[PDB]
Each structure stands twice: as C-alpha cells, then as structure tokens.
Design a protein around this ligand. Structure first.
Ligand SMILES: Cc1cccc(C[C@@H]2NC(=O)[C@]3(Cc4ccccc4)CCCN(C3)C(=O)/C=C/C(=O)NCC[C@@H](C(=O)NCCOCCN)NC(=O)Cc3ccccc3CNC2=O)c1
Length: 165
C-alpha cells in the first residue's frame, strides 16, 4: 500500500499562502503516520482544520497542531492524549522533514513541525514520519513570519487540510 499524501492549506492574516503537500511514511512509522492522516481528515471528530502554526523560528522549524490550547501546551492524538515514540528510524535530514513535536519521551499528541534546516540534534528525540513533497515555498513563507522567540508576526492558520486520494 502506497504512503498517504495529505495537505495543509495555509493563510497568513486571512490571505492564502498556498498548499503544502506531505508524504507520510506509513511504511516505516505506520502508527504515527495514521495519527497525522486522521487528524488531517478529521475522521475521529477533531483535527487540524482551523488550527495555527503557533511557533515558527527562522532557520529552524515551523510548528503547529495544538488545536486544544493553541499555544504549544496541548493537543491530543487519535489514540489518547499522548502516545509513545514509535521508533526513531527516520532522521532529521534537512529542510522539509515532518516530525512530531513533544514535551519529552513518549508525549506525542497532535503537535508537529516542518523543518526549514537540517535539525540533526533532534535525532532520536523526535519521531520523524514524513516530508514535504510540494509547497516548500509555502513553508518558507510561513517561516518568514516567525521570529527568534517563535511568536508569529501574522496569524498563520491551517484553513483546510485532508488526504489527497
Ligand atoms: C504537551 C505537549 C505535547 C506534545 C508537544 C508539545 C510541544 C512542546 N511544548 C513545550 O515544550 C512547552 C513546555 C510545556 C508546557 C506545558 C505542557 C507541556 C510542555 C510549551 C510550549 C512552549 N515550549 C515549551 C517551547 O517552545 C520549548 C522549546 C524547547 O524545547 N527549547 C529547547 C531548544 C530547541 C532548539 O533546539 N532550538 C534551536 C533554535 O535555533 C534557532 C535558529 N535561528 N528545541 C525545541 O524547540 C524542541 C522542539 C522541536 C520541535 C518541535 C517542538 C519542540 C519543543 N516542544 C514543544 O514546544 C507539548
């Protein structure tokens, strides 16, 4: 079975930035990939639609997915509030890596990040589970509205998301 492709359509201050297309590596991390896929489609009754990129740091990563507290302290997975680190097989190889945000070991929920640089120091600490395959330019636009603290200069909103099937 082919790896799922999913999308995020992103606004800045109500103005469309475009579409990010992500391949989820369900072959290597099936459980982590399925959580993200299901949060994109909303099929458990909750997910990413309408939530924000709440922490964006230039030359590091763009972080999103806290649809419960919208500030980096929340989120939940389709398995429960948190689920374990599935494996650390895939590595933070460069820009475009899609990886799980966490608050330490075995705290995956819904928050995720897209790298804008090789973040190798996160290897073995954050579960990588996909990669940008179209729309890296959009990711760079998101990055342009970040700051050193991560606070965004514009409201960055995932206005739609889903699975490309
Ligand atoms: C409950 C839950 C479940 C799943 C995910 C999450 C998100 C998770 N919430 C948090 O921890 C906190 C703490 C808290 C409070 C209440 C409940 C739970 C936790 C709240 C949000 C703000 N909060 C801390 C940070 O912001 C932390 C930054 C950090 O960990 N600082 C170290 C160096 C940096 C790097 O390497 N910086 C390089 C800078 O180079 C700039 C170049 N120009 N590492 C990082 O950011 C590591 C990293 C990596 C990817 C994604 C996220 C994160 C951080 N995890 C968070 O945000 C929370």
């Amino acid at each position: 079975n082919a790896n799922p492709l999913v999308y995020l359509d992103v606004d800045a201050n109500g103005k469309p930035l475009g579409r990010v297309v992500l391949e989820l590596k369900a072959d290597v991390v099936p459980k982590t990939a399925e959580n993200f896929r299901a949060l994109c489609t909303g099929e458990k009754g909750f997910g990413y639609k309408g939530s924000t990129f709440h922490r964006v740091i230039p030359s590091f990563m763009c972080q999103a997915g806290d649809f419960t507290n919208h500030n980096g302290t929340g989120g939940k997975s389709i398995y429960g509030s948190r689920f374990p680190d599935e494996n650390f097989t895939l590595k933070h190889v460069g820009p475009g890596v899609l990886s799980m945000a966490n608050a330490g070991p075995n705290t995956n929920g819904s928050q995720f990040f897209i790298c804008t640089i090789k973040t190798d120091w996160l290897d073995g600490k954050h579960v990588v589970f996909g990669h940008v395959i179209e729309g890296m330019d959009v990711v760079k636009k998101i990055e342009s509205f970040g700051s050193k603290s991560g606070r965004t200069s514009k409201k960055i909103v995932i206005t739609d998301c889903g699975q490309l099937s």
